[PDB]
Amino acid sequence: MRALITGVAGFVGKYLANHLTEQNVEVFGTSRNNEAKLPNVEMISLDIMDSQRVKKVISDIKPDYIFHLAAKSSVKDSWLNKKGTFSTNVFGTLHVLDAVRDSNLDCRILTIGSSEEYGMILPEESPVSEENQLRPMSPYGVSKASVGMLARQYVKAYGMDIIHTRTFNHIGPGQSLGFVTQDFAKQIVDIEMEKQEPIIKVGNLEAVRDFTDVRDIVQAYWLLSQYGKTGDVYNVCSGIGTRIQDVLDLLLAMANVKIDTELNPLQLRPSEVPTLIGSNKRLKDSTGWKPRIPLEKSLFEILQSYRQA
Amino acid sequence: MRALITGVAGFVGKYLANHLTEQNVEVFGTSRNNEAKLPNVEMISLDIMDSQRVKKVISDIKPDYIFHLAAKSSVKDSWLNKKGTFSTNVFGTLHVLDAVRDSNLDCRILTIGSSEEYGMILPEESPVSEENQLRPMSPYGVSKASVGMLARQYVKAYGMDIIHTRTFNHIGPGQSLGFVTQDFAKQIVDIEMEKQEPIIKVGNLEAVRDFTDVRDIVQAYWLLSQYGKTGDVYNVCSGIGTRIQDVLDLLLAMANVKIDTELNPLQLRPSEVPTLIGSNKRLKDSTGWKPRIPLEKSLFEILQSYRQA
């Protein structure tokens, strides 16, 4: 009946809160933005790095569910901020887990991991299933791999109720800049608004990612909390690989001016996973989840968001 | 040739320093205690958690080799100090790597990892080789798995010269208390000296570990520095599994007096790897290394160290 979402003012957070409120769940959300407000959410000021405040907030609210979304979410920025990505993602998670363990709460925690935990996938391994070797290629990936490992250990050592996800690329209106669909859509609309030369600036167009709309993601998170098996890991993904080139092409075909493409070398990463496509069989079998929103719709709605801003 | 050993005043460090000085390597060593001192080592005061002081030391010395041993080495203690084990092992390592990166030094770094990175190994996987998946069971294991992943990433992203070890249990005279062969030997000699009732307090006797004498370990580290392949991971182990029961029985057979055995529940860990036995084939093939000192001899010399004060 009672859910706590850390990082509720983030991209996924707002959609998740909306989704839970519609399932008649009482929603509490935490953020560092002491002015942030969300419809039907009790908002709580919390820095996930303040271990004693994490333990106070969780002790006060006594949630039945925690969806732990507070994190440094950028792969790109983890190269520059390796330690900060690790302190926030690993230690923030530990503070949450230790709060529950200490309060001895009857609570299920969903920890949010990443397809970056897999990293380099052997061609024979794709689409990747949950038993696949973890070979992270980015510092972010190392942080999420550590979160997952600790999740499993807390289940084993302390009898806790934790489910870890490995979420693949998630997209939709409201995602911050620094992520590919936002970075591209934003330039396109600026070009339409004659605020930028008709030339779009891009990074690596050869990468392949598995994209799912944030609205489908939060349904999967809800369903996992309800039907998932304690201590299991679940891929949350569409099972379809799209080249970044084709994400760009889909977006450009929706623009109402002709647009040239140009390499921006500051968008390249020191090392990157060339391809990530996941198997969602475990998730589908456990929950009856299916993605519903096609990539084309997601991308169009992102363009619409910038256009109406 | 100049070598820098971090954590030089630790168990492995003192032996490694002695070994390197015998190879006509100029040895510089770091420790947090300013009242240390080692034959033929230039001692430097350094806390590995001080990123700017780490850079300064590495900038000053301009070493050809760094043997990075500074760490929180206890698996037992990692359950109580999860964040400290993480900050020291992962961030300490990042400080070293970034210092070398910044100074653009022509330097090979040996990062020291652990069989705890493997964790739970399937019977068909034993003895484990370096491509086995990582399924750590202890927070310590997560910290070392992260060190290894990051070492591989710095090679790939930045073109650095780094070799990572996965070292299995290492033993010998001078190891601190809190590790099994020391905890057992100390009590036996205290019992011989009539300082303790003839009952030894012990933890889990059913665990299996792969033991190698520290004098052999440091030869492996030296040889890897010379002959190892950049970006490769090497198990450093004997390939022989010994039950802790049998470790104890070997020690009791060497004692003066009949000694009974009793469980001390405080020696039990929340969750533990039942069995770790490694393949040393990659190391032997690359370097010609072989373990020379039998387990019985290591255990004997440990007892002698307590008996001789």
Ligand SMILES: Nc1ncnc2c1ncn2[C@@H]1O[C@H](COP(=O)(O)OP(=O)(O)OC[C@H]2O[C@@H](O)[C@H](O)[C@@H]2O)[C@@H](O)[C@H]1OP(=O)(O)O
């Ligand atoms: N020290 C912290 N204490 C409390 N919250 C923190 C702290 N550091 C960061 N966050 C928050 O986490 C939220 C993460 O949201 P987004 O960056 O928009 O990511 P998204 O909602 O797409 O991803 C949610 C989860 O899904 C994963 O992909 C990602 O790593 C994360 O675990 C942000 O609002 C971010 O908030 P802020 O914008 O830094 O104030």
Ligand SMILES: Nc1ncnc2c1ncn2[C@@H]1O[C@H](COP(=O)(O)OP(=O)(O)OC[C@H]2O[C@@H](O)[C@H](O)[C@@H]2O)[C@@H](O)[C@H]1OP(=O)(O)O
């Ligand atoms: N923040 C720190 N800054 C500088 N040094 C540090 C810091 N934290 C710990 N150390 C040192 O690392 C040394 C590690 O030595 P032992 O605990 O005796 O471990 P051992 O020498 O058996 O193992 C060497 C390597 O092999 C692995 O077993 C272990 O994780 C480590 O990576 C200790 O002298 C330990 O010294 P101290 O007793 O904690 O002062």
Ligand SMILES: Nc1nc2c(ncn2[C@@H]2O[C@H](COP(=O)(O)OP(=O)(O)O[C@H]3O[C@H](CO)[C@@H](O)[C@H](O)[C@@H]3O)[C@@H](O)[C@H]2O)c(=O)[nH]1
């Ligand atoms: N951001 C960005 N990415 C670009 C650009 N050009 C090409 N790309 C490429 O587009 C791909 C997706 O990058 P991002 O959208 O930044 O996300 P990510 O690095 O894959 O990480 C996202 O997905 C993970 C799940 O796999 C999430 O765990 C993570 O938090 C994030 O949402 C990457 O291969 C990136 O190099 C650009 O201009 N901007």
Ligand SMILES: Nc1nc2c(ncn2[C@@H]2O[C@H](COP(=O)(O)OP(=O)(O)O[C@H]3O[C@H](CO)[C@@H](O)[C@H](O)[C@@H]3O)[C@@H](O)[C@H]2O)c(=O)[nH]1
């Ligand atoms: N310390 C200790 N261990 C005991 C005792 N009784 C049983 N044990 C068991 O003896 C085994 C060895 O434990 P330790 O000597 O504490 O070492 P460890 O946890 O295996 O870790 C050591 O080896 C790793 C390499 O695999 C190293 O990475 C790590 O730094 C450390 O040296 C474990 O299964 C432990 O539970 C006891 O009284 N004391």
